[PDB]
Amino acid sequence: LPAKGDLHIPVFENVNVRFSPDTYPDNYNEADGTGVYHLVNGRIILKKITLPEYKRNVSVSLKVTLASNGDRWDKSGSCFVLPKSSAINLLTIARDGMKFPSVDSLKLEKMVGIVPGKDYLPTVELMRFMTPFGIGHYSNNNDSLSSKRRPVYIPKWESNVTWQQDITDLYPLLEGEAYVGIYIDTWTSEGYLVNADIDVKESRLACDVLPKRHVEPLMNTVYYMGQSYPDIFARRDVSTDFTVPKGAKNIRLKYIVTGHGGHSGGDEFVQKRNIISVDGKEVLNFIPWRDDCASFRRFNPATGVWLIKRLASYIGEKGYTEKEVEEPLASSDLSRSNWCPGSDVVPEEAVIGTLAPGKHTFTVSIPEAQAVDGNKLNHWLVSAYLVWEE
């Protein structure tokens, strides 16, 4: 098998992801001079990549560097790829007037685009991320503003955040021509600055043949374009049917979930079990949760802060002593439903192996999820797909 060499793709360089109708007036706006499409008024950036026709096996990684350009919030992000066999996609919708297929309101309410339908497979996420609170733009380490915000145990603010993930399994969606993009739920004109690279390592072996891989998009509740907050789980489970062909080998489920609702007692800050199933049998069951958000403090200069009273032990003049202090607690410190401001989300994974050829059902259940209530925006960002060899 012939080599086509490694490949470094700088998908995005210092691109401003933002909300600006004055700059990007429509949902579709022609690619700029750098080949970057700005959709949904700047909230989505998209780019056509071209990979060689690899005959050898490869590995693929995604690297994303991000900073705030003035936006002060920890907003949801998603680096994604538009699936192959789907005439309807984010681009064709915005550009060519395509629409997410109509849904049965009894089973999916008004939740368009979240599961497959006629001429539609859900967008597939290469990486889910959560921006920190104002990194870079508000990361001033000069004594002036720092002493007031920066805790004594944090020597300096980082100027940006970088995430890296192996996306080798999604290779079938990158092969040939593919549209890769980044969405950030930003509503400020300032927005964010992002870089994104896709690197491909080609095997140095003349015998290591590229396996025939497949990706099956099952679900994606991320509200990219004309979609609403996904609280449907507060009222019903969400299911989709899918087809497994003969010969499918080593089937694996990938499940990317984060919970949301930034108000007190909202699903962002409260434990809710996710039960995922195939053909009615549980294959994943867990509480999406992180107890380690303090570890991201340095990435979160613009976070809100409270004072919490605590009787704290300490070393004083006369030895081991005790005193009530008012200790700062950052919003960025709080435990959350599978993320911290400044983290990415590594997909949970279940090994299925083989399934009977034909139709199967995929179900996601978050039975105790809270509904949207006024300005309380509880919801669950869930995306999932199957990968397998043919």
Asked whether the beta carbons of 229 and 377 are under 8 A apart, the reply is yes
Q: Does 105 bind Cl ion (CB under 5 A)?
A: yes
The conformation of residue 36, written as its DSSP 8-state character, comes to E
d(CA 218, CA 122): 7
Backbone angles phi, psi at 78, to 5 degrees: -155, 115
Distance of closest approach, residue 271 Cβ to Cl ion, in angstroms: 17
DSSP string, 213-232: EEEEEEEE----SS-----G
Q: Which does 316 bind (CB under 5 to 8 A by kind): Cl ion, a second copy, none?
A: a second copy
Residue number with CB closer to Cl ion (137 or 254) = 137
d(CA 82, CA 362): 21
Q: Which does 326 bind (CB under 5 to 8 A by kind): a second copy, Cl ion, none?
A: a second copy
Instruction: Name the nearest CA neighbour of 362 among 341, 384, 344.
Output: 384
Residue number with CB closer to a second copy (98 or 154) = 154
* Residue 27, both tokens: 């949902």
Residue number with CB closer to a second copy (155 or 374) = 155
Q: Which does 85 bind (CB under 5 to 8 A by kind): a second copy, Cl ion, none?
A: none
Distance of closest approach, residue 206 Cβ to a second copy, in angstroms: 8
Q: Which does 109 bind (CB under 5 to 8 A by kind): a second copy, Cl ion, none?
A: Cl ion
Q: Which stretch binds Cl ion (CB under 5 A): 114-122, 135-143, 243-251, 271-279?
A: 135-143
Residues that bind a second copy (CB under 8 A): 147-149, 151-156, 205-208, 291-292, 294-298, 304-308, 310-316, 322-323, 325-330, 333, 335
Site of tokens 């403090």:
297
Helices (H) and strands (E) in the chain, counts: 4, 20
What are the CA-CA distances from residue 81 to residues 125, 183, 282, 348 (Å)?
A: 6, 11, 28, 19
Distance of closest approach, residue 3 Cβ to a second copy, in angstroms: 15
Asked whether the beta carbons of 198 and 171 are under 8 A apart, the reply is no
Count Cα atoms within 13 angstroms, Cβ side, for 178.
23
Indicate which single residue of 142, 204, 280, 322 sits in contact with Cl ion (rule: CB under 5 A): 142
Q: Which does 105 bind (CB under 5 to 8 A by kind): Cl ion, a second copy, none?
A: Cl ion
DSSP string, 294-360: GGGGGG-TT--EEEEEEEEEEEETTEEEEEEEEEEEEGGGS-BSS--TT-EEPPEEEEEE---SEEE
User: Binders of Cl ion among 272-311, rule CB under 5 A?
Assistant: 304
Residue number with CB closer to a second copy (30 or 324) = 324
Indicate which single residue of 53, 143, 291, 324 sits in contact with Cl ion (rule: CB under 5 A): 143
* Residue 218, both tokens: 């099952």
Give the bridge partners for 284, in sequence order.
276
Q: Which does 294 bind (CB under 5 to 8 A by kind): a second copy, Cl ion, none?
A: a second copy
DSSP string, 251-283: EEEEEEEEEE--STTSTTSS---EEEEETTEEE
Residue number with CB closer to a second copy (31 or 325) = 325
Residue number with CB closer to a second copy (316 or 353) = 316
Asked whether the beta carbons of 63 and 217 are under 8 A apart, the reply is no
User: Binders of Cl ion among 325-344, rule CB under 5 A?
Assistant: 331
Q: Which does 306 bind (CB under 5 to 8 A by kind): a second copy, Cl ion, none?
A: a second copy
Q: Which does 208 bind (CB under 5 to 8 A by kind): Cl ion, a second copy, none?
A: a second copy
Instruction: Name the nearest CA neighbour of 170 among 229, 295, 107, 256.
Output: 256
Residue number with CB closer to a second copy (140 or 335) = 335
User: Binders of Cl ion among 230-269, rule CB under 5 A?
Assistant: none
Q: Does 109 bind Cl ion (CB under 5 A)?
A: yes
Q: Which does 153 bind (CB under 5 to 8 A by kind): Cl ion, a second copy, none?
A: a second copy
Residue number with CB closer to a second copy (25 or 320) = 320
The site for Cl ion (CB under 5 A) is made up of 72, 105, 109, 142-143, 304, 331
